[PDB]
């Protein structure tokens, strides 16, 4: 059941509830975790496993303002306090490694340069920059030569995550960012070895996960994927073929887990992968687990508004709704001031 302990690769989890990666845009100077962030995560450490907010491996890979990094010592040292705070509550925390690719803005990029991508095709989405929402910039298609360098930024970012006391990492292979831009033909128009087929489109994602897995162990490596894009995501002519291939290859690398943002056949992916499946509601989630479809279930917004989400799912206490206006940016308010259940109600 949802509330009983389990293991993920090496580590041991108090329960099967995962806190999904949620961007909050509250990092400080130098993309170092802001001073309240340790608290934020420790408040939610009753989660079996926390996946951190997406965290850029380089400034090139930054796409939203005030998201944190994992590439300078300042950031590492900021993260140590957070891993410590989580661990002192008996918790687990994995860092989600990020490269946004074309989902960025010149204002965030080194020297005002153009964001990078497999092909020079702008995304039709906005980002949060200069304290407002603006269309993402036109990207530059990456030279074949640069790719090994990006694989190495992930490699190095994984070893920085271990320095910082994380229990492992999660490669961000989803939600329209760099590695998915390569994976999906809606955005990968290349004709070299990193495009033009299932196997080529899939090459960067697999190279990145293979390098991360070698650096730190497959047992501390996970990846997130999202086979079916939303309406305004990346077009993908045949995601089933694409993601059956990718999961076959991921399973071959021996990695601890896949994290799937869920007409598509997930049972195929589930079958192909021989370790943990993290799927991304209490009672359907329970059936989903009972049914053998997943091993862990990741909840997103509910963890924003209910720090005691695990306890409330277990007791039946009603859940607090999110203040949506305070998710991204700002202060303690709508971040660390969400009450636990006893501090929410009036008897009369």
Numbering used by the authors: 5 to 266, 277 to 294, 298 to 365
Article passage:
The structure is the first published apo (FMN-free) form of OYE. The core of the structure is formed by the TIM barrel fold with eight parallel β-strands surrounded by eight α-helices. The XdpB structure revealed that the putative FMN binding site of one XdpB molecule is occupied by the C-terminus of a symmetry-related XdpB molecule (labeled by *) arranging XdpB monomers into infinite linear chains. In XdpB, FMN is replaced by side chain atoms of the symmetry-related Asp364* and Asn365*: the position of the C-terminal residue of the symmetry-related XdpB, Asn365*, is fixed by hydrogen bonds to the active site residues Tyr181, His176, Gln100, and Arg228; the interactions are depicted in the Figure C in S1 File as a Ligplot+ schema. The Asn365* side chain atoms are stabilized by interactions with Gln100 and replace hydrogen-bonding FMN atoms N3, C2 and O2.
OYEs 3D structures adopt the highly conserved (αβ)8 TIM-barrel fold with a closed, central β-barrel. A characteristic feature of OYEs is the β-hairpin lid formed by the N-terminal amino acids and a well conserved FMN binding site formed by the C-terminal edges of the β-barrel. XdpB has the activity of morphinone reductase and catalyzes hydrogenation of the codeinone C7-C8 double bond.
